[PDB]
DNA polymerase eta (Homo sapiens), 431 residues
Amino acid sequence: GPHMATGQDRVVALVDMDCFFVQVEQRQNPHLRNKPCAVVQYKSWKGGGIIAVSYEARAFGVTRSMWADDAKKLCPDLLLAQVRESRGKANLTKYREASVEVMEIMSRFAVIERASIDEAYVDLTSAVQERLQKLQGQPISADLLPSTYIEGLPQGPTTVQKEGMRKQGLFQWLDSLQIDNLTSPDLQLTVGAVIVEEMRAAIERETGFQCSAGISHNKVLAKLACGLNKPNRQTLVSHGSVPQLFSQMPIRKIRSLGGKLGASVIEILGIEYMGELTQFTESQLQSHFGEKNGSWLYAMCRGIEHDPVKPRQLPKTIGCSKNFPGKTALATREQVQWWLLQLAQELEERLTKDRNDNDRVATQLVVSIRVQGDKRLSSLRRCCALTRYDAHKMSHDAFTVIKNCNTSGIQTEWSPPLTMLFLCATKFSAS
DNA sequence: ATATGACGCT
DNA sequence: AGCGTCAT
Ligand SMILES: Nc1ccn([C@H]2C[C@H](O)[C@@H](COP(=O)(O)NP(=O)(O)OP(=O)(O)O)O2)c(=O)n1
Ligand SMILES: [Mg+2]
Ligand SMILES: [Mg+2]
């Protein structure tokens, strides 16, 4: 009827840096540019664990979480950059500082939600509307969109080359555009995409880093759109593109469906693709997955989703962690204390930096451990008051709240051994 | 032998 | 409060 909300109220973008840690290393070491390379942690065991892979090394099948020694068998020319190590653990400061560079540039254009070290959602609804009153009724030239793909286009009688494809779809999209109607959702996305071109040009201009972006009407679609044409390209996913796109879209590819919920949707409903969800009533979906999940699934498979872009570029928690897999699991009281102290010393540096930059203090310390055999991330979390940014107090207090977990008759020893220590400062207060 | 961060459920 | 899910 005339009372159907199509989920086209917003223009939302998601910007994600291309092989981000690699780009940070490649900017600093020009010998690594335009080469198969990867960023690795801890060179001692099997060459180090790979955490980021350039697109040149991906062409050989090198992936994240692979051992560097194994990646070298797939790609003998692979160059490696090692993560900084401080206090016997990985130190990600260089990438956090690179991340702040990118976030501050994006923040100049619109309200952003920091979503990870290398990505942020952008709510462009206001910027698009303002622009719709300033760029006048002046048409949108294809030159304003030199790196944009229109998902689903070109269609019909028109190639062979990807940029030929990109242009043809953009041409079909822009020819079909009704610019005399400032409330066309498709025109709004187009203006959003122009804006995202400009903010991606600014990021590259001011940092050297390339990135990809999705532009659509909500966070889920924008994130999906972002990966469609990685790297160094952006993708507009219109409401109209959703039925064809979702008809062969595996369910696990949708944000929040990559885990157990996504698996249960597939197993319980007997489907493979996002589009098959539309044949179920909302009540049926709620009967299987809960009121909130069923409702979310019912709207989402029609391309509709209402999670807002939260105005937040600052983390809500600040944390330091280290895993101790296998025979490295911590098995004496001295080890636990020493590592807690190493974690607390890095955390104190980060928190002091945070308070000076951001006018806030953390008030609660969360201590998370994992014990050997437990396959869950955390086996146990406990908390106490974070009153002084003092590493020796924080490490001692963290020890106080977990020391009863030790079921060891001998007091020098720690049993069962700990496979993870994690200190997280939270409950930030205005200061 | 897979360093962190956001959040939901009870 | 403490645990579970989902994610980069
Ligand atoms: N488990 C993980 C996942 C990502 N990261 C770091 C390394 C990544 O370069 C950076 C961003 O992760 P990402 O966006 O998922 N993939 P990345 O940016 O490396 O390549 P793209 O696939 O986005 O082009 O977070 C990590 O340190 N541990
Ligand atoms: Mg990325
Ligand atoms: Mg990312």
Remarks:
- The first strand of chain A starts at residue 12 and ends at 17.
- Chain A is about 40% helix and 20% strand.
- Residues 20-93 of chain A form a domain with the MutS, DNA mismatch repair protein, domain I fold (CATH 3.40.1170.60).
